[PDB]
Design a protein around this ligand. Sequence first.
Ligand code: HEM
Ligand SMILES: OC[C@H]1O[C@H](O[C@H]2O[C@H](CO)[C@@H](O)[C@H](O)[C@H]2O)[C@H](O)[C@@H](O)[C@@H]1O
Length: 153
Amino acid sequence: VLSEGEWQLVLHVWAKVEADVAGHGQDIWIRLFKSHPETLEKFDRFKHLKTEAEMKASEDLKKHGVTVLTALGAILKKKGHHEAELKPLAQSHATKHKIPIKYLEFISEAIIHVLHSRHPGNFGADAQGAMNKALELFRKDIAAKYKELGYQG
Ligand code: HEM
Ligand SMILES: OC[C@H]1O[C@H](O[C@H]2O[C@H](CO)[C@@H](O)[C@H](O)[C@H]2O)[C@H](O)[C@@H](O)[C@@H]1O
């Protein structure tokens, strides 16, 4: 359970992400797909992208980043009371997309890397710790739902 202070560190940096969610999403995809190429294979719609240039030029990938980060933002704004938001997400990711918890760890790492790079003014050690705590809570709760849905994760 995160403290209100921790949630505020999370929400304060997210406020910066929201100045341009599309741009942050692109950086996150590039970071994720380069650090862990295997994750790209899970996207039938994007697995043909061969380079960072192609990823950057993809309007659909950009749009999906907006979708993903907006969904994550809604979860973070719930400050732990995200039961309703997690249900549809866990169901599609467990049953249709088949995304292991390990891959969720990979994208969490990419998110933190990008925030660390773009936002040193709001992403110092304490802020990063709070964000990591929030993402771990997210993954913990997703894992529990995966279990209920019958997916090993
Ligand atoms: C921060 C974690 C994540 C969030 C908030 C998230 C959110 C979303 C949302 C909102 C959608 C669209 C609706 C749906 O199908 O549920 C989606 C689709 C999808 N997600 Fe995720 N996702 C996350 C992580 C991942 C990861 C790590 C992978 C893959 C390694 C993944 C693979 C997919 C796939 C394959 C789709 C379908 C894309 C398409 O439209 O072709 N997701 N995700
Ligand atoms: O922070 C680094 C550790 O990250 C992962 O573990 C955290 O998140 C898991 C959920 O994805 C939890 O099960 C675990 O309890 C958390 O500590 C990773 O699995 C660990 O190997 C890393 O050391």
